[PDB]
Amino acid sequence: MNPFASLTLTTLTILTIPIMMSNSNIYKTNLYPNYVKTTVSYAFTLSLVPLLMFMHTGQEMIISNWHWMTLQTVELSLSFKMDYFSVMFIPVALFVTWSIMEFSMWYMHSDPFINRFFKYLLLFLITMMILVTANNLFQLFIGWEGVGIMSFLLIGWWHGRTDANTAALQAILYNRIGDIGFVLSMAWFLTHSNAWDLQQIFMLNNECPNMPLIGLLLAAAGKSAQFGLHPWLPSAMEGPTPVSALLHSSTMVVAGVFLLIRFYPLMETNKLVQTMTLCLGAITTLFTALCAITQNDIKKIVAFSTSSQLGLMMVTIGINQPHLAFLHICMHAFFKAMLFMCSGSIIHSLNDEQDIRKMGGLYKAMPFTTTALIIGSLALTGMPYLTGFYSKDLIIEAVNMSYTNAWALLMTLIATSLTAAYSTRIIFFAFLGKPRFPPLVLINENNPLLINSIKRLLIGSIFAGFIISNNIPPMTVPNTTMPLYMKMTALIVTIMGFMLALELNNTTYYLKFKYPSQTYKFSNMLGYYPSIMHRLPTYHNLSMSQKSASSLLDLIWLETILPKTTSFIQMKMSIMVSNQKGLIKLYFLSFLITIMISMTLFN
Amino acid sequence: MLKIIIPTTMLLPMTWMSKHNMIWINATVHSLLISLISLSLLNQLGENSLNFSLTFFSDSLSAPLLVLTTWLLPLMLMASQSHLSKETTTRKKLYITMLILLQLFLIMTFTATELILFYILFEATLVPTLIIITRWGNQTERLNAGLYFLFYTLAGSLPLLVALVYIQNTTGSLNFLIIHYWSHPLSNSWSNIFMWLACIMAFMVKMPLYGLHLWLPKAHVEAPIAGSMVLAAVLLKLGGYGMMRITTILNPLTNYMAYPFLMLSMWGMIMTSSICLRQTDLKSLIAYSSVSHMALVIVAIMIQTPWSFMGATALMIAHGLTSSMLFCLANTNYERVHSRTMILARGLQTLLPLMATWWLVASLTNLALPPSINLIGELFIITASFSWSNITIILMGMNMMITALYSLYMLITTQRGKYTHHINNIKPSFTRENALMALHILPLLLLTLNPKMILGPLY
Amino acid sequence: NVLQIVRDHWVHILVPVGFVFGCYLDRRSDEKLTAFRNKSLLFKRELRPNEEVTWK
Amino acid sequence: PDSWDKDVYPEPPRRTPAPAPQTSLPNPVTYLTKIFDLLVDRPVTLAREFIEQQHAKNRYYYYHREFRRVPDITECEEKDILCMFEAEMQWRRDYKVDQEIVNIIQERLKACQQREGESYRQNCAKELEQFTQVSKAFQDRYSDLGAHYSARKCLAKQKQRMLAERKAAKEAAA
Amino acid sequence: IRLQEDPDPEDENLYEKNPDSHGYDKDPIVDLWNMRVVFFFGFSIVLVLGSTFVAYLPDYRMQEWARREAERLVKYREANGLPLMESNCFDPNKIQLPE
Ligand SMILES: CCCCCCCCCCCCCCCCCC(=O)OC[C@H](COP(=O)([O-])OCC(O)COP(=O)([O-])OC[C@@H](COC(=O)CCCCCCCCCCCCCCCCC)OC(=O)CCCCCCCCCCCCCCCCC)OC(=O)CCCCCCCCCCCCCCCCC
Ligand SMILES: CCCCCCCCCCCCCCCCCC(=O)OC[C@H](COP(=O)([O-])OCC[N+](C)(C)C)OC(=O)CCCCCCCCCCCCCCCCC
Ligand SMILES: CCCCCCCCCCCCCCCCC[C@@H](O)O[C@H](CO[C@H](O)CCCCCCCCCCCCCCC)COP(=O)(O)OCC[N+](C)(C)C
Ligand SMILES: CCCCCCCC/C=C/CCCCCCCC(=O)OC[C@H](COP(=O)(O)OCCN)OC(=O)CCCCCCC/C=C/CCCCCCCC
């Protein structure tokens, strides 16, 4: 037998194993975090093996091991699609999760429920693996909702925090609108294709229609926090830093992009949905970068950077370049996870301080996190030969060289410049200058766990792009011929954003105070979208829930029509019948009238 | 079916002859034994039903409901023994007798092979329920709740009796097999319209349909814990079972008379979810959630496709289990603080951890979280409604969003936050309560493992 | 003693004997419906040399 | 394998290319496959050999039930309950068999798509046509019978279809 | 006041007299045996035995039989050129349409 299926299913099963040990003395002791981390590392190597198998001969398989149920002519079975996407995403996700779990062993030392935290992280990893390897729509939806509910559980990790509860419920709401779209797509696919699996969907849908493709697009936008459904991702920073580093930025928010990638044949068949995806990605990346360039919370800045990168990936899908989107998924996972880990290290060193206005002097205060963050920012902005170069540069070239929307192309370029701008802002306000933190210096980054996790995610941020780019087979025709200025477009806009942001940030040293502008207020306050869209619609819906449905209809009029009017009529008639004075003269005269009526009327 | 009916009629003398301190033990043990015996009905055929005799028969639709009833009886016994410690021995025996009679009537209802016998038994289920509500309810509103429940159900059901006797006179038999093999099309006329109205309106009132539901909040809020458990788990499913059984002879008139009921069910599902969003009472919240789920079942039955019936059956079973569990959790919190206000007791996540876990699992099953049978049934109904029309997806999506919103709102309000400072009588959760929650939740996950057992004859 | 224990634990046989009686009554009800035994077109067959009925 | 019929479940003959290395570097995939064979394949093979040896000692058989044909609803007289019941049961069994036939064809289609991979659009035209024919016939037979479907309703639908076909043919010949 | 009514008694705690109480009854022995019978019968007997019984229920729905019959019919029809799915459920020769 080919070791492919055995090794892949073994990686999944050994990921599941430590959950079965969650009712044991090992779960009761303090060895559970290290136990889970070791299991994740072993799974990572055991999943690297099938990646080596694929890199040689390009082997791909489907494993429908267990048959769940047959609904007349529709068979649902537990099937895993071990293809290029799965065998490339699994090792990357496992590597990132391993690094995050070690960083969490360092970072969450004082948490009373660190064992439960590690169990939740492992459960999220299991659900994400189910989502990635799912071969049919029902199993994909299982993974979808699993990662959604794990996000809900981990965002509101501190149950006593009202803001945490609000953020968790907000994420659930937006992902549930996405699930509305997903269920629309699933229902259409079943009705018009008699199956819920990719093989038959691809066979029967030779020209996929707008209704299923728009359903998929809505689900992807909801899960990946595109414009319209974006605010939940930045608000998801209420959870602990390991949750933000692993779940949201790196692995979970790419679920919608991955879903769109998995239906790239249908996306190729359609054109209107491709245009809508391109425009949505462009507006998302521009808006989120513009909001990012003026935030004062480092976690917020990194979250908006993640949203902008998701918008760029959606742009990549919209120009019919699905494989570049997956490559960017991997590279972004690497360097964004490292950036979030560096931000968490800074926060922990400065005693839970998440304000760049209070950070400063960390370039020499903390050498290793400083160099790691600089490397991550250079990779994010597209340093000419780092991990982000082998995806972002190709994405920009494809955008320039394709039959794209002019406004979408312009917004993509401006978003790249603003990416450079907010990376400059992070570095400038976090490491350069004089200290602004409280005088009691508790800075200490000499922990081997933190150092080793950042080291593991740091070698990937430099070399992984080259290796992955040179090992994958050519999935698309390259853009060999192009003008020199159009080749340099990404670098030129990156340098321009760097210089402009650096000049504007250096202007802050002047002893000159000026009131904020309308554009600054719009950008800092997230475009006013959370304010209006979180106060007006919710107020109207909740007011209608009680004023109209509960009070006016349920408690007033539905009571007035059937039960109250009938009872009132019965009471009135009963009073009328029983209101007799007991006078024989009266009711004997009534008898006479009755006798005459019977004699005359009835014949 | 006598091997299941007679053991209950022997449970009655056991209850009335047991010692004063052994009534609960005996009733629980032998109810569990009867449930184990009744598990045998799940071995159904692929072609026809199980016809035991001229009076009782079992089907792939009747079997899961019977198993649910037999499994639900001991849970009601546990909750009742929780809240009836100070009652006299005679009144404890009377309460157990009422529960036993209700289970016996439900079993005979689900196994009755003739429409008139089914009517007699499903009407007989009112008397024990009314006695339980109006006698062992805590609040002053139990009397009004019982009146509302009784009169809604009877005003629905009397025209059903007239329709059944008229059908018997016209066709010669009310036996279900005869009326299925000898079914004839129902021509479009006022007489057939009113026969359809009589039957469907009786079962809609039993469902309940939106606009005919007030008795459900009234009864469920004001009934004792056992009464609330049986009202939502099984008694609500009598309407769905009847509609599945009675719609054999109502075609093709159902294709045209279903529009008002479908519109009512969809819009009232949305309205009751929105009501759940703004409820100040936990029992009322659970009752309106039940209303929304049964409205979805009504939609499935009315659209009347093989894919809708399977989803309807699965949703009925899943909703029964989930509603019983939610009512039990609310009753435990009520026994802690002697009040049903949802915001009175908070911080129960940090006051009672494992009970918070039970709350989380119950709320996760309440919303359609895959691969739970709740999600299986809801998804089948949504797909069938999508095939029916392509805006039903809009309505179902809105309902799902509001369902998740109010479920997690209940969970966060009851569990998360900071505990009430002045509430200091919240003792650690009892082994009995935890066992009750475990017995509520584990069969749900096992049915998730094996889903074809609750998908009905259409599977 | 046994006499005191049995006087309290004699009720536990009621449900088992009811189950046995119910199974017996099910058998009796089935034995009254043998009007088409070994006469259905789908399952009609010749009897084995050492059996009297196809099902009881 | 002999477990299933190769004609019922077709599979093209596999064509695995012979390895033609062009480097002096070792093959990590080859080494890991050798290690997998030495550590997993041999132990599981020994365990299965022992299990099969245990199975062969107590060999016993099970059979496939055979149903003889019975008169259908067309032959059944009006309100003849016994014949109607027999015909309804036979129709239900045939309905289940047809559902499984459609399932077999769908499984064949899915397997062929996955096997052909990047050129599935051209190489799977044969299996798409078979599925198209089977789905068309199955839909025509059991499309909109309803939740309370029966042999009488299917027969009425077939009668309606035949009347429409006869009217169309008569109009064409007119 | 308008009646001779008892005051509302204080709520009773089972843990006060019996610290290791399962919440079933006041008497410790009866409480323990109620817990034992509930746990044993319910969990062990009902859950485990009924679940394995349902898992190993015989295939009376004829799913496997239907699959085998479909396999045989597909083999026979494809081996002889006949259509895999017939176009008619019944025989037009046996159906007598009105004129
Ligand atoms: C309905 C409209 C719909 C529009 C849709 C399209 C929107 C596109 C927007 C694109 C981005 C615009 C610029 C950023 C806006 C936000 C500024 C902000 O909040 O700054 C504070 C924030 C720092 O705030 P803070 O440190 O917390 O302190 C508070 C401030 O002190 C507080 O001081 P402040 O309040 O005085 O600072 C703000 C002030 C000063 O800040 C700036 O000017 C920042 C931007 C400077 C660079 C952008 C202009 C030049 C770009 C191209 C230069 C090279 C061109 C090519 C040359 C060679 C050709 C061969 O900004 C302005 O006065 C507005 C400038 C931007 C206008 C955007 C378009 C019109 C908006 C609506 C009309 C109203 C505009 C007037 C304002 C409202 C009424 C009073 O600034 C930064 O972090 C740096 C921002 C700029 C860095 C990136 C620069 C490059 C990327 C953008 C340009 C595109 C380059 C690549 C083009 C490729 C083409 C193929
Ligand atoms: C080829 C053979 C294949 C296998 C065949 C197996 C056949 C088994 C035949 C014997 C069964 C009867 C004896 C064992 C009964 C269980 C006792 C037990 O495990 O106790 C340990 C457990 C644990 O014991 P414990 O916790 O009290 O004791 C621990 C030890 N000390 C004393 C130190 C504390 O017992 C309990 O928990 C008691 C709970 C109440 C038990 C009531 C039993 C009533 C009589 C049996 C009724 C069974 C009905 C089953 C349903 C109908 C049939 C399906
Ligand atoms: C503390 C840590 C918790 C997590 C770890 C727990 C320990 C590890 C457990 C891991 C389990 C993960 C799921 C894996 C399950 C493996 C077994 C499962 O796959 O078997 C199923 C078995 O399914 C069972 O049927 C499910 C039992 C369903 C029981 C229903 C309720 C039982 C009665 C309860 C009464 C309540 C009634 C409720 C209303 C009806 C599949 O069915 P099937 O493939 O075919 O069986 C094959 C045998 N055949 C071929 C002969 C058929
Ligand atoms: C298809 C169905 C319809 C889809 C749109 C319907 C929207 C209905 C709105 C839901 C009603 C809300 C019910 C109760 C929800 C919980 C109560 C609540 O308001 O939560 C408060 C919480 C707190 O706000 P914060 O910003 O975190 O401030 C915290 C300060 N301490 O706010 C929220 O979470 C509400 C968020 C959702 C509000 C509605 C926004 C959705 C509108 C966008 C729809 C358009 C989508 C466009 C699609 C584009 C992709 C193709």
Descriptive notes:
This is part of a larger assembly, with chains A (603 residues), B (459 residues), C (56 residues), D (174 residues) and E (99 residues). By secondary structure, chain A is mainly alpha-helical. In chain A, 73% of the residues lie in helices and 3% in strands. Chain A has helices spanning 3-20, 25-28, 32-57, 84-107, 114-133, 137-155, 162-193, 198-204, 210-224, 232-235, 241-252, 255-262, 264-269, 272-292, 298-318, 322-349, 362-365, 367-381, 389-401, 406-430, 448-471, 484-487, 489-506, 518-524, 529-578, 584-601; strands spanning 61-71, 74-82. Chain A has a two-stranded antiparallel ribbon with strand order 1-2. Chain B has 459 residues and is mostly helical. Chain B contains 21 helices and 2 strands. In chain B, strands 1-2 form a two-stranded antiparallel ribbon. With 174 residues, chain D is mainly α. Chains in contact: A-B, A-D, B-C, B-D, B-E, C-D, D-E. The interface between A and B is large, with 46 and 48 residues. The structure holds cardiolipin (CDL), 1,2-diacyl-SN-glycero-3-phosphocholine, ligand PLX and 1,2-dioleoyl-sn-glycero-3-phosphoethanolamine (PEE). The ligand CCCCCCCCCCCCCCCCC[C@@H](O)O[C@H](CO[C@H](O)CCCCCCCCCCCCCCC)COP(=O)(O)OCC[N+](C)(C)C sits between chains B (39, 64, 67-68, 71, 317, 443, 446-447, 449-450) and E (46, 50-51, 54-56). Chain C: It comes from Sus scrofa (Pig). Chain C: Keywords: Electron transport, Membrane, Mitochondrion, Mitochondrion inner membrane, Respiratory chain, Transmembrane, Transmembrane helix, Transport. Chain C: InterPro entries: NDUB1. Chain C: This is NADH dehydrogenase [ubiquinone] 1 beta subcomplex subunit 1.
Helix content of chain D: 55-70%
The set of bound ligands, ions and cofactors reads: cardiolipin, 1,2-diacyl-SN-glycero-3-phosphocholine, ligand PLX, 1,2-dioleoyl-sn-glycero-3-phosphoethanolamine
- What structural category arises from helix and sheet content of chain D? mainly alpha
Specify which chain pair forms the largest interface. Answer: A-B, 46 and 48 residues
Per DSSP, the total helix count of chain E is 3
**Major sheet description of chain E:** none
Q: Tell me which oligomeric state these chains represent.
A: part of a larger assembly
In whole angstroms, how far apart are the ends of chain D? 57 Å
| Helix content class of chain E | 40-55%
Largest sheet of chain D: none
- CA-CA gap between termini of chain E: 92 Å
- Give the percentage of residues in beta strands of chain D: under 5%
In angstroms, what is the radius of gyration of chain E?
Answer: 34 Å
**Element order, helices and strands of chain D?**
HHHHH
Q: Could you tell me the strand content of chain E as a percent range? A: under 5%
The backbone outline of chain E, from C-alpha atoms, is elongated
DSSP helical segment count of chain D? 5
Order of helices and strands of chain E: HHH
